[PDB]
Design a protein around this ligand. Structure first.
Ligand SMILES: NC(=O)c1ccc[n+]([C@@H]2O[C@H](COP(=O)([O-])OP(=O)(O)OC[C@H]3O[C@@H](n4cnc5c(N)ncnc54)[C@H](OP(=O)(O)O)[C@@H]3O)[C@@H](O)[C@H]2O)c1
Ligand SMILES: NC(=O)c1ccc[n+]([C@@H]2O[C@H](COP(=O)([O-])OP(=O)(O)OC[C@H]3O[C@@H](n4cnc5c(N)ncnc54)[C@H](OP(=O)(O)O)[C@@H]3O)[C@@H](O)[C@H]2O)c1
Ligand SMILES: NC(=O)c1ccc[n+]([C@@H]2O[C@H](COP(=O)([O-])OP(=O)(O)OC[C@H]3O[C@@H](n4cnc5c(N)ncnc54)[C@H](OP(=O)(O)O)[C@@H]3O)[C@@H](O)[C@H]2O)c1
Ligand SMILES: NC(=O)c1ccc[n+]([C@@H]2O[C@H](COP(=O)([O-])OP(=O)(O)OC[C@H]3O[C@@H](n4cnc5c(N)ncnc54)[C@H](OP(=O)(O)O)[C@@H]3O)[C@@H](O)[C@H]2O)c1
Ligand SMILES: Nc1nc2c(ncn2[C@@H]2O[C@H](COP(=O)(O)OP(=O)(O)O[C@H]3O[C@H](CO)[C@@H](O)[C@H](O)[C@@H]3O)[C@@H](O)[C@H]2O)c(=O)[nH]1
Ligand SMILES: Nc1nc2c(ncn2[C@@H]2O[C@H](COP(=O)(O)OP(=O)(O)O[C@H]3O[C@H](CO)[C@@H](O)[C@H](O)[C@@H]3O)[C@@H](O)[C@H]2O)c(=O)[nH]1
Ligand SMILES: Nc1nc2c(ncn2[C@@H]2O[C@H](COP(=O)(O)OP(=O)(O)O[C@H]3O[C@H](CO)[C@@H](O)[C@H](O)[C@@H]3O)[C@@H](O)[C@H]2O)c(=O)[nH]1
Ligand SMILES: Nc1nc2c(ncn2[C@@H]2O[C@H](COP(=O)(O)OP(=O)(O)O[C@H]3O[C@H](CO)[C@@H](O)[C@H](O)[C@@H]3O)[C@@H](O)[C@H]2O)c(=O)[nH]1
Lengths: 350, 350, 344, 342
């Protein structure tokens, strides 16, 4: 009997994780927010009959990480063996203007879910996965970063996720809950939110190729990231819960690239060579072959306290879990641009 | 200077109101929830460039009715002349299992918005519209229901909206805020949420017509409602803020029909005549011409405390605003079925 | 098995209710807020040094309410906990909504979560503030509600969420629609205790003058010791019904001031009008009462007078203490207190 | 212009800080919770240049109204659910007040347009060291919290750092170690011991129960530590500092030294929850152990290194452990003899 409860099931990771666990024969339950319109686009294919919306081995429940009673009711009805806490306000720029909501969902909501496990009498039966993050390293104190690199958060998102990391450790130590922190670095896919930098670039490049757009604006072009594929990373979350002891792990590729490089490589897939001119907020990217400007900079996309550089060392996970990433940067860029060209050609309003 | 701020801009009513105010020359601002997917499908045609998603006279801001600082920041930046508080968890059945979240958004959230107006120094310069509701009458104490009919709520949604009604009256009386309660009766459209009874029926009948669904289940077939068209009702909201004095008004058709009638008329639009057999949870609806059962009853769609009957008396609004409804019940049903058949032919999952 | 859980046990009513249920042999549990100082002065005398147990909690913390209810398994719950001051509710509107409105829902949801919906009896502390603007005099159960403060609006939410749990789930839950009740343990910020304490300081030479707000407001004032018995009676009833509890007599604040001063040998004579009105002692010539606009409310509740016929008929309840006797008892107690400790 | 706003003015530290600032000629404003009873006992003697305002660290509108009306030059955020044992049963409330409440106050400063004119003090804590990663602990020792209180205070520490770095707010974390006084809350171990010992001396009590006798702490005096808070805001640059005595003693030693001041020598017998403390001179048992006073995850050992504060602020403690014990026992004897129910 394998019964999983996923908070954040409608998100990028929750959609891939649901597919992965269904293939292994799990009964999969998800918590979905009430919405005035459709919000299940990433998972609508996982109904027994998607046309008629008839559920099979995936069951959805209305709820929210800010409603204490709804979490107790769902956990008591489902009695899960595994809980994956993926639900969050996950956008770092948005966290600067929505700091209080971000604290309530990403920080206090982690405690609410842990308290619901305890209220339901499941502290000694459930295994709990927390969605921790390389944003905890912020202004990095070591390069590369690994499990024993000290934390230095740099946004209201990072501060909220730091609370969540430590409240999970305290339940593990105080009550012997099997609970783990996955310290995941950036991971993307064709299902990535449109407001994250990689998907923003692939969508915009697609629209330019098709004549639906002339130019778009970015923020800090010199930021450097470790980018993997979400489909690979959800496997690591499951492996952490199969481990004999509840241990925390970094999950990453170890390879670093700039935003500028993501832009350059994306445009090469549509036959265009970007050459940069200007400085600071006045920098632009121009196509060599046509002379047209396609990329500009706008300070509205900068963050007040930036995270300049991330590079993860996942040696501990490779040794203990036998996890390895499959998709590297060049393949990720290609896949994202190709998927967005097909999407935008089929539907220009997408 | 005509500058509107709409909470709940992504919802049914917010989408039609945004269009109406833009046609009258307003600068229109909306508060939008952060979502992991797009949630702006009802208003994406109101960008200056819809393929490129570039804003014109409509401007969107991230926020939530539970985040105090965001509301003050938006109101202080925008300095609106009119505020329409349409944001809510609006589903009555869902409110029984999300009672606490519904109280915080629909009840306390109204107070947060009023307090933001006061904090920003705008108590003498803004006009405020509250989205009140015929659910306040609940177990109806008069037939028909008018502004002076006593309230008798019958759900956590109704109780939260009752708090909101009275906190608005108290700001009007204490501080001379121009604030009004629109006591609107049920209003529908092709943009109505899928989980409301009218849109559930029109979508299900469309799928049956396309041979993609055999049967669907409803709850209480004998519930009676006053149903109008959302496009007509957003005009009344605007008229209530054009009034010289702040007054509360009932907005309704005055005509009553059952859920069962909505079902029968919907099926006639696809060439089928429904004849009913049996009682209570064992009642079924069978097509006379083919012999096939297309409608069953499931107790899971019933509410613990039902609102059996609503019929609005809009005499005061006809006399003081010169408002009248344009769309009647028969036309509403025809429009919703025709729209959903056309939609279902392109996408069987709608 | 008689096991009561009282939210608001440290307050005026909770202290008298605790005594009442203890005298009848109940096991009494209370929810107490964490404080940086001592906050249990009204109930310290009820320790074994026994049958009263205290638990740390808050009406805004969901998990604590479930933990307490699951451990205690009460047969009766009295939700007396609240930010209960009407003037303060205008400056603390959001906190007042969260505690007095949503907190009632949290407690009802805790009962449901703990599986006690069919076993517990639930008393809600409802209020005559729900009759904020009135055309019917006296007011009874069928008089319409019209709140006039953020306190009143929060209490109206609480009244109706209680009704919805009764109707939806067949919970035995009742609204006590209680009119003003006072005592020597009444909070000092309420008008009656403000007057008695100030009159007593003036008597002992500790104070010369004090200021009030609206002198012409009219109220139905009873004694808290009488009203807590009515709460228990409502839970012993065969069916869950809502009741008005009141004296039926109405007096002004001006009247309360005049009578209080008569108990210290002084005859109050008023001069001027509105915010510049003062009360002077006739036999000495000294000004002892002024008016300050800062003590007015933006939206006043002008007049309250309750008809408790339903309660007299179904519960056999009647009030024992009247306005004149209450004034005498409060002024007498504060005179003792200020003589025995001028810092009390 | 010198105008202070103190959250937590009714608590131990707020009462000493109010006195200190008033003696320097500050206008002092405080935020007080509505209570059904009197809650201003520590500051009632200061009734002028002190003004009190009703509020709560969970009510956003009240914080903006107060900050906009007062326009303080200095804010001290001392308000908190501050009891570590209670935090295990009130984890959600503790997060909302101690964690989120710090963000609400910072956001109010920003909303009111005061980022460049206010200096902000945050009440951080040696509980951040939890399971100590070094001995003694200094500003660079890694944090490892061990309760819902400690986790909430960790969020508060880092949201303060983020406002400093993002917006150039003059904001600082005082990383203060345990500090006590005759006004210390009765539920903390030092005041529990001094009150119980005073009652035993006067024949008003026979015996009391404690939890973990072998926990070790660095204990100073609150009057000295509020001075350090003010010095951190007079500094030219906004820096974080450890404030401590550098001396460590056990709960067991606090018990023994307290009883010596009333003429009794405690000798211990038995083990774990069956351990008792007996007076050698009389043979009478006065101390027992009850597991109900233990914490699920204990903080075993705290000892602070305040070299940075000595070098940059010229701060030093005036009172050490032995004088603190003497002062607390003598004050509680005088209190209990003057009023048996105090
Ligand atoms: N590179 C990465 O992607 C990365 C790396 C490390 C950690 N993380 C963290 O890993 C998790 C999954 O990332 P993702 O990319 O899949 O994020 P995502 O696409 O933004 O998905 C977030 C999910 O959380 C849900 N959610 C938001 N607020 C909620 C609330 N109040 N109550 C309940 N559910 C709520 C969202 O629902 P709606 O669809 O209704 O908005 C959505 O299902 C997040 O916690 C994220 O912070 C991500
Ligand atoms: N018959 C009727 O339609 C009727 C009659 C009387 C009164 N009402 C009331 O009138 C209003 C409009 O009705 P409708 O049919 O347009 O409702 P709807 O389609 O359900 O729209 C609700 C809107 O509120 C937003 N919202 C929900 N929770 C929010 C939060 N926490 N913060 C900010 N925004 C939030 C939703 O955003 P998402 O898109 O992100 O979910 C959406 O924009 C509602 O208040 C409803 O209760 C409706
Ligand atoms: N005339 C009347 O007295 C009258 C008439 C009708 C209705 N009522 C209502 O009846 C009830 C009792 O009145 P009263 O005069 O006894 O009021 P009170 O003296 O002001 O007592 C209020 C009680 O509620 C507690 N409380 C406040 N906030 C709380 C929170 N967030 N969580 C948990 N407990 C909290 C208080 O604790 P602290 O001691 O820590 O502050 C205190 O125990 C109240 O609900 C009041 O609104 C009173
Ligand atoms: N050894 C130490 O003493 C030490 C060491 C490091 C850090 N700290 C921290 O330093 C600060 C002061 O310590 P202390 O010993 O003076 O604490 P305390 O005696 O417990 O005082 C706490 C203060 O905060 C107030 N408060 C509690 N909840 C509140 C809320 N929701 N809204 C507004 N105010 C609220 C309390 O009011 P009431 O009086 O109404 O309860 C009281 O005034 C605290 O933040 C504490 O955690 C203490
Ligand atoms: N979104 C965005 N980022 C931009 C832009 N221009 C430059 N950037 C820079 O590109 C980098 C990546 O930004 P995001 O794609 O938004 O991701 P993130 O901030 O690293 O956060 C993501 O990864 C975290 C793990 O490190 C996750 O915790 C988080 O939830 C999120 O998925 C940042 O340094 C950002 O400033 C732009 O127009 N948009
Ligand atoms: N949703 C739904 N309702 C059903 C079903 N079967 C029967 N009904 C009945 O159909 C009636 C209408 O339900 P809804 O369409 O969900 O609307 P509502 O509960 O009346 O609430 C709507 O109108 C209110 C004004 O009266 C609004 O306040 C509210 O937000 C919402 O828009 C109710 O009596 C309901 O029990 C079913 O399967 N689904
Ligand atoms: N407190 C106060 N009230 C004053 C003053 N001067 C005049 N009043 C007037 O005296 C009347 C009584 O005020 P309170 O004693 O504060 O009581 P209340 O507002 O009637 O509220 C109490 O009774 C309600 C039931 O009617 C309760 O619901 C509520 O919790 C509270 O106990 C009000 O009309 C108030 O304006 C003054 O200086 N202080
Ligand atoms: N309170 C208490 N503590 C006891 C008892 N018996 C033993 N102790 C032990 O005595 C030690 C001190 O406990 P407290 O006096 O409660 O203080 P604290 O947990 O160290 O917390 C105080 O200091 C922190 C700084 O380190 C502050 O952050 C916190 O707010 C509080 O003031 C702890 O190890 C505790 O387990 C008892 O009966 N009561």
């Amino acid at each position: 009997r394998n019964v999983a409860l996923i908070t954040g099931i409608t998100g990028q990771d929750g959609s891939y994780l649901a597919e992965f666990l269904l293939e292994k024969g799990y009964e999969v339950h998800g918590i979905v927010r009430r919405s005035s319109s459709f919000n299940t686009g990433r998972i609508e294919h996982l109904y027994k009959n998607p046309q008629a919306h008839i559920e099979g081995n995936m069951k959805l429940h209305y709820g929210d990480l800010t409603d204490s009673t709804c979490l107790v009711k769902i956990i008591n009805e489902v009695k899960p063996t595994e809980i994956y806490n993926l639900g969050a306000q996950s956008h770092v720029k948005i966290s600067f203007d929505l700091a209080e909501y971000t604290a309530d969902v990403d920080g206090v909501g982690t405690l609410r879910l842990l308290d619901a496990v305890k209220t339901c009498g499941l502290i000694n039966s459930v295994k709990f996965y927390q969605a921790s993050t390389s944003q905890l390293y912020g202004k990095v104190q070591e390069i590369p970063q690994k499990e024993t690199t000290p934390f230095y958060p740099r946004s209201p998102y990072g501060a909220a996720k730091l609370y969540a990391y430590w409240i999970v450790v305290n339940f593990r130590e105080a009550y012997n809950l099997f609970a783990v922190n996955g310290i995941l670095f950036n991971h993307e896919s064709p299902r990535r939110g449109a407001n994250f930098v990689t998907r923003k670039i692939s969508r915009s490049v697609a629209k330019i190729y098709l004549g639906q757009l002339e130019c778009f604006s970015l923020g800090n072009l010199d930021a450097k990231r470790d980018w993997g594929h979400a489909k690979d990373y959800v496997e690591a979350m499951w492996l952490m819960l199969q481990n004999d002891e509840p241990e925390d792990f970094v999950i990453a590729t170890g390879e670093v690239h700039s935003v500028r490089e993501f832009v350059e490589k994306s445009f090469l897939h549509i036959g265009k060579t970007i050459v940069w001119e200007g400085k600071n907020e006045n920098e632009v990217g121009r196509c060599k072959e046509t002379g047209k400007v396609h990329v500009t900079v706008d300070l509205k996309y900068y963050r007040p306290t930036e995270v300049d550089f991330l590079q993860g060392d996942c040696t501990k996970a490779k040794q203990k879990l036998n996890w390895k990433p499959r998709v590297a940067f060049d393949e990720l860029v290609r896949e994202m641009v190709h998927a967005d060209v097909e999407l935008m050609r089929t539907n220009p309003n997408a």
